[PDB]
Design a protein around this ligand. Structure first.
Ligand SMILES: O=P(O)(O)OC[C@H]1O[C@](O)(CO)[C@@H](O)[C@H]1O
Ligand SMILES: [Ba+2]
Length: 288
C-alpha cells in the first residue's frame, strides 16, 4: 500500500507490510527503510524532519554539486552538497501497486527560493522510488528544460547504511580501485583486500560499473549489498568521534559506530547536458 500525508509518503510491501520505506517530501528524503521490520538505514536521533535543514541520515539527495565548489562561477555560490536536499519536492503520485512505486519532482519554481536565486539554472528532476520485497531502488532522471543553456551538475545519493558496529565492519569489492582521499588530499589505488574502519574516512572511489556490487560484511554475513547504474563514483564516509561530536544534529555521539555511508554518484567531474537532453541513473539496495 501507499499512504500520503502532509509531510511524507509511506510505502509498505503488499506481501509483507513490515517491509516499508518512508520518504519525506522535504528533499524527497528517504529516512527509513525497513526490511521485514528491520531498519536498514541510519538516522540521527537529532535529525530534523521538519524541513528546517537537511536530514542527518537516510538518503539525502545531492545535486547540482557534490561538496563545496570553488572553480565555477555559479556552482561555487551554493552550500555544500547543493539544493535538492534543502527543497520540498512535489509528490507526483504512484505508478505501481506491486512493487509499490512512486515519483517525486523538483523544478526551480518549487525549489528553495534562496538557493534558486544563487543558482538560477533550469532543470526538471524526477525521483522514482520502488520498494521490492527484498530491495529498495531509488532512480533519478534529470532533464535540461532550457532551450539555450547547457546544464552542468553532479548527482549523488548520500546513503547512510545502518550497521551494528563500525570497528567489526568491512566493505568488499573495492580492492584495487583508484580513489581520491578527501582527508589526505591525494589519489591512490586501494591495495587492501577489504575496506576496514578505525578512524575518520572520507574517500571517493572511481570507475565502479553496473557489474560491481559492493558488500557490507559483519561477522562473515553480508548485511548490505549496493548496486548502481550510471554512477561511476562511490564516496565512502564515516565522520568518526571528533566530527560526530561537532555536528549539532548528530546524536547519539557514539552513533558513528552504527553507520557507514557508501554513496554512489557522479562527482569526479560534472555531467553536461545539452538543451532538452536527459540523464538517468539509479541506486539499488538489497541484502544478498
Ligand atoms: O554535513 P553535510 O553537508 O551533510 O556533509 C556530510 C558529509 O558529506 C561528505 O562530503 C561525504 O559523505 C563528507 O565530507 C561530509 O562532509
Ligand atoms: Ba567535509
Amino acid at each position: 500500500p501507499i499512504k500520503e500525508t502532509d509531510k511524507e509518503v509511506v510505502l509498505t510491501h503488499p506481501a509483507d507490510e513490515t517491509t516499508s520505506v518512508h520518504i519525506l517530501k522535504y528533499g524527497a528524503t528517504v529516512y527509513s527503510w525497513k526490511l521485514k521490520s528491520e531498519e536498514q538505514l541510519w538516522l540521527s536521533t537529532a535529525a530534523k524532519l521538519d524541513g528546517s535543514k537537511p536530514v542527518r541520515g537516510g538518503i539525502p539527495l545531492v545535486f547540482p554539486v557534490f561538496g563545496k565548489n570553488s572553480t565555477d562561477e555559479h556552482l561555487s555560490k551554493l552550500p555544500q552538497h547543493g539544493l535538492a536536499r534543502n527543497s520540498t519536492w512535489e509528490f507526483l503520485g504512484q505508478t505501481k501497486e506491486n512493487p509499490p512505486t512512486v515519483q517525486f519532482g523538483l523544478k526551480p519554481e518549487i525549489a528553495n527560493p534562496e538557493l534558486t536565486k544563487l543558482w538560477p539554472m533550469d532543470y526538471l528532476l524526477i525521483l522514482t522510488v520502488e520498494l521490492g520485497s527484498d530491495y529498495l531502488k531509488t532512480a533519478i532522471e534529470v532533464e535540461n528544460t532550457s532551450s539555450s543553456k547547457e546544464l552542468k551538475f553532479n548527482w549523488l545519493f548520500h546513503t547512510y547504511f545502518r550497521i551494528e558496529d563500525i570497528e567489526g565492519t568491512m566493505v568488499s569489492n573495492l580492492a584495487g580501485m583508484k580513489l581520491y582521499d578527501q582527508l589526505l588530499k591525494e589519489s591512490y589505488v586501494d591495495k587492501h583486500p577489504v575496506v576496514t574502519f578505525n578512524q575518520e574516512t572520507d574517500v571517493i572511489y572511481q570507475n565502479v560499473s553496473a557489474e560491481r556490487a559492493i558488500q557490507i560484511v559483519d561477522k562473515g554475513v553480508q548485511i548490505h549489498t549496493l548496486k548502481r547504474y550510471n554512477l561511476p563514483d562511490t564516496v565512502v564516509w564515516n565522520p568518526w568521534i571528533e566530527k560526530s561530536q561537532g555536528m549539532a544534529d548528530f546524536e547519539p555521539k557514539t552513533g558513528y559506530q552504527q553507520m557507514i555511508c557508501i554513496e554512489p554518484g557522479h562527482v569526479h567531474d560534472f555531467i553536461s547536458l545539452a538543451p532538452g537532453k536527459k540523464w538517468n541513473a539509479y541506486q539499488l539496495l538489497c541484502k544478498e
